[PDB]
Amino acid sequence: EQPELEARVKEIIEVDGYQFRDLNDNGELDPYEDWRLPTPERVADLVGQMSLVEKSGLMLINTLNAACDPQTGEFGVLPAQADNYINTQHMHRFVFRNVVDVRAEGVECTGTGTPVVSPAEAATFTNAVQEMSEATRLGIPSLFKSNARNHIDPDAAAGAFSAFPKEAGIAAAALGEQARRTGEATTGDMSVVADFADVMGEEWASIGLRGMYGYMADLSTEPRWYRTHETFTEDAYLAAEIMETLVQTLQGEELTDNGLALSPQTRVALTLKHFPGGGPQELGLDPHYAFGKAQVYPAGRFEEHFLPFQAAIDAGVSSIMPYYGVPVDVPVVGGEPGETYPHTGFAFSDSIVNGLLRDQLGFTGYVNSDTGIINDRAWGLEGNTVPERVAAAINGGTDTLSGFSDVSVITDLYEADLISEERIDLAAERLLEPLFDMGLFENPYVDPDVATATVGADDHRAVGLDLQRKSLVLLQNEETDEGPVLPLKEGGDVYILGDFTEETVESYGYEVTNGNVAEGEERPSAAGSDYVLISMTAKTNAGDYVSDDPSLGLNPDHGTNPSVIIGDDGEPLPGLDGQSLWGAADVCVHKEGHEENPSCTDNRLRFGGAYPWESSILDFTGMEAAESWEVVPSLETIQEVMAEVEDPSKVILHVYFRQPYVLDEESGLRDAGAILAGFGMTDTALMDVLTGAYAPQGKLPFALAGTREAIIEQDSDRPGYDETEDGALYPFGYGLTYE
């Protein structure tokens, strides 16, 4: 039963014949160093031994990236920041953001930016941090978190994390496999999600990356929200099933007496994101920005949106991250009638994070804040000081704060008696508990050579390729006089436009003319082609946005922000009276804080999204004409190319529905011979299905509209379009198949 032990600074101590690590270096087996004691008794013994700064340092989590020594020429070295974070801020949680991949020959360690690190180099970096954490007085280990890594970027061998379709494609593939085996498409064949999660957990754990910022349980019920690209589905029951499988596969199925799925077999502890559900954004605008503070619920579906989180809580998820949106007129769950959650950001609401999440939904783990939101994105708290903002989060129930690297911030709060020592301790118990249950006090190191053998292994990449082929959804397969168009015929001339690699397409045995020409040069005609292959999407370009510019945010010609958030002080929040200019909600204009010349929080729309006055343009014709949207390749070119072939049924459209884009009848895109929704796949996965080596089997995990009107006109918290006039062009569950 002796758990494997690894110490590279502290000494191994024996007692009762068994072995242990002396992380305190007292020479005695302190109870917290005893792996046989129950974990609540271990933490009780360790928190009793820590100073307030040490316990306050657990409430911080910040970026700690691998570094490169420009003279040593070695990658995977501790950066400067590590010593400060570990020994002075007493931090034990970090975000790992380096890309893991094999650098090309000629890559020199330019001391600038986050270097690309190989799997073995990441593992050595993570081990180094763990060793510094072992050198700490109480040698508490560290935990790294990361955003998702196993997904194809649809706008871009061993060594990198294995590549799967985007989250929505995982849902599409799961639905399609249930449909193939039972003819139905509702809650999905979670065997595909467990197969995905099994690759990720293996590769993540092998580099010492035992935590995640994710996955996202948010529902794609509002199509104008730019974050729909990171959601699995619009259907809460499918998402809840996905969240349950993710937790059971990435964390164990072994739940402790405290209800948390945490064992030494936990490969990745999850921090579910955007509780209680950031999907229903008003006008699709996102809370990262002052104009988009509001989350509205016209169909009364607030309970449906936290349903996925419930199933993950019930499965034993380790951590929860609250969003920064303001619930507007949401009936408090388990409360007297007429009561509405305070018009304050969830990240600051004691009633959501302690009441809804902990008391009503039963959550026993710890709560982890989001980044870049506590100091300058405290909605409902624009009048407050920055320390008051921080105390509202912590007393509201948030235990660790993301993007904070100065422990003096917490102790200044405790000194100013804004936060209690009892709180700093309750936080410490919740934050220390997973480090014990996951076995990190016994062995927090990983073997770097095994990382080379694991990250991107041949079988792992085969599973991702499998899911890519199964994630494609055939939306339209016109039947010619000759027969179906998509099972492509062997041989023929083929015109390509968009992100097709010409040689991989030639390699299937086709003569290919390449429509993708530089801007200046001339583009060959598509006349004569037997098939036209177009891979198309749309992106934002909002980087010019300035809130205080009279041309932009203060431009009356751009209309007014129709969103109204009435504060509990009874006066509207600045700029959110329903009658202000789009840039009026930003602090640099309202200036309702304790800083004289506050900087704008929305300028450049750094995080994504369109110009707010354009966030309802999701049809391709409109996007082509909009200022902050771009169709790629331009819809003008697509339409020329579709004219040059005298039959539009020779056009195959591969569309990446980053949001639920509208194939309007004006665009002509619905006259193509075939239309497919892709969520990220290699060119050979795509050509495999189009050529009939594999048949398409995936189903849409969110409905698609056919009218600009249905987009404006659907309920932000409701899935589908059935409540709209024009309705859904394609519903959830829709999937054609080669017959």
Q: How far apart are CA 654 and CA 533, in angstroms?
A: 8
- CA-based nearest residue to 139, from 6, 9, 263: 9
Q: Which range, of 213-221, 302-310, 604-612, 684-692, touches Zn ion by CB under 5 A?
A: 213-221
Min dist CB 106 to Zn ion, Å, is 29
Shortest distance, CB of residue 662 to Zn ion, whole angstroms? 13
Q: How far is the CB of 284 from Zn ion (least distance, A)?
A: 10
Stated as kind and residue range, the H or E segment containing 312 is helix 307-315
Q: Which residue lies nearer to Zn ion by CB, 258 or 649?
A: 649
Residue 730 CB, nearest approach to Zn ion (Å) = 15
The b-or-e profile of 474-511 (16+ CB within 10 A means b, else e) is bbbbbeeeeebbbbbeeeeebbbbbbbeeeebeebebe
CA atoms of 490 and 352, how far apart (whole Å): 59
Is residue 646 close enough to count as binding Zn ion by CB under 5 A? Answer: no
Nearer to Zn ion, 658 or 718 (CB): 718
Q: Which of 6, 101, 388, 447 binds Zn ion (CB under 5 A)?
A: 447
Stretch that binds Zn ion, among 182-190, 597-605, 619-627, 718-726 (CB under 5 A): 718-726
* CB contact at 8 A, 328 and 296: yes
Residue with tokens 């964390």: 251
Q: Please pick, from the candidates 114, 147, 516, 649, the single residue that binds Zn ion as defined by CB under 5 A.
A: 649
Closest distance of CB 248 from Zn ion, Å? 10
Chain position carrying tokens 């191994």: 12
Point out the residue whose Cβ comes nearest to Zn ion.
Answer: 649
Residue among 390 and 703 whose Cβ is closer to Zn ion: 703
Residue 479 to residue 551: CA distance in whole angstroms: 50
Give the integer Cα–Cα distance in Å for 72 and 6.
28
253 binding Zn ion? (CB under 5 A): no
409: its two tokens: 């911030």
Of 554 and 728, the one with the shorter C-beta distance to Zn ion is: 728
> What's the half-sphere exposure (Cβ side, CA atoms, 13 Å) at 213?
25
Q: Which residue's CB is nearer to Zn ion, number 647 or number 709?
A: 647
Q: Kindly tell me which of 449 and 595 has the beta carbon lying closer to Zn ion.
A: 449
For residues 39 and 454, which CB has a smaller minimum distance to Zn ion in the complex?
A: 454
Q: Is 30 in the site for Zn ion (CB under 5 A)?
A: yes
Residue range at the interface with Zn ion (CB under 5 A); choices 109-117, 455-463, 568-576, 703-711 = 455-463
Nearer to Zn ion, 131 or 370 (CB): 370
3-state helix, strand, coil in the chain (%, to 5): 35, 15, 50
Measured from the CB atom, the residue of 295 and 714 that comes closer to Zn ion is 714
- 8 Å CB contact between 104 and 152: no
Q: Which segment (175-183, 328-336, 491-499, 714-722) binds Zn ion by CB under 5 A?
A: 714-722
What is the rounded radius of gyration, in angstroms, for the C-alpha atoms of the chain? 27
Q: Which of these ranges, 102-110, 217-225, 616-624, 700-708, lies near Zn ion under the rule CB under 5 A?
A: 217-225
Contact flag: residue 26 with Zn ion (CB under 5 A): yes
Q: Is 433 in the site for Zn ion (CB under 5 A)?
A: no
* 447 versus 630: smaller Cβ distance to Zn ion: 447
CB 575, CB 589: distance < 8 Å: yes
User: What are the tokens at 605?
Assistant: 């729309």
Residue 368 Cβ vs Zn ion, minimum distance, rounded to whole Å: 10
Q: What would the x/- binding string for Zn ion be over residues 411 to 430, using CB under 5 A?
A: ------x-------------
Q: In this chain, which stretch among 131-139, 335-343, 441-449, 604-612 interacts with Zn ion, using CB under 5 A?
A: 441-449
Contacts with 575 (C-beta within 8 Å, 6 or more apart), sequence order: 290, 291, 561, 581, 583, 584, 585, 586, 589, 590
d(CA 450, CA 153): 26
Which CB, 327 or 448, lies closer to Zn ion? 448
> How many Cα atoms within 13 Å fall on the side-chain side of residue 251?
31
Taking CB under 5 A as the rule, does residue 714 contact Zn ion?
A: yes
581-611: b (≥16 Cβ within 10 Å) or e: bbbbbbbbbbeebeeeebebbbbebeeebbb
In this structure, what token pair is assigned to residue 137?
């007085």
Neighbouring C-beta atoms of residue 415, cutoff 10 Å: 11
- In whole angstroms, how close is the CB of 728 to Zn ion at the nearest point? 10
How many residues lie near Zn ion (CB under 5 A)? 16
> DSSP for 397-410?
T--BEET---THHH
CB of 570 to Zn ion, least distance (A): 30
**Residue with smaller CB distance to Zn ion, 175 or 457:** 457
Instruction: Give 24 or 621: the residue with its C-beta nearer to Zn ion.
Output: 24
Angstrom CA distances, 498 to 489, 533, 629, 654, 685, stand at 21, 8, 17, 9, 16
Piece in contact with Zn ion (CB under 5 A), picked from 93-101, 112-120, 165-173, 709-717: 709-717
Q: Which stretch binds Zn ion (CB under 5 A): 25-33, 122-130, 693-701, 725-733?
A: 25-33
**Closest by alpha carbon to 707, among 675, 661, 673?**
661
Q: Which of residues 507-546 bind Zn ion (CB under 5 A)?
A: 511
In the complex with Zn ion, the residue whose CB is nearer, 50 or 64, is 50
Site track 365-384 with Zn ion (rule: CB under 5 A), x = hit: -----x--------------
Q: Which of 5, 6, 22, 387 binds Zn ion (CB under 5 A)?
A: 22
Residue 185: closest CA among 175, 172, 195, 177:
175
Rounded least distance, CB 33 to Zn ion, Å: 5
Interaction between residue 449 and Zn ion (CB under 5 A): yes
Is the N-terminal amide bond of 215 cis, ω within 30° of 0? Answer: yes
Written as six digits, the tokens of 571 are 């006066």
Q: Is 295 in the site for Zn ion (CB under 5 A)?
A: no
221 near Zn ion, rule: CB under 5 A: yes
Pairing label, strands 674-678, 473-477: antiparallel
Query: Judged by CB under 5 A, which stretch of 103-111, 260-268, 312-320, 643-651 contacts Zn ion?
Result: 643-651
Is residue 203 near Zn ion by the rule CB under 5 A?
no
Q: Which residues of the chain form contacts with Zn ion (CB under 5 A)? A: 22, 24, 26, 30, 221, 370, 417, 447, 449, 457, 511, 647, 649, 714-715, 718
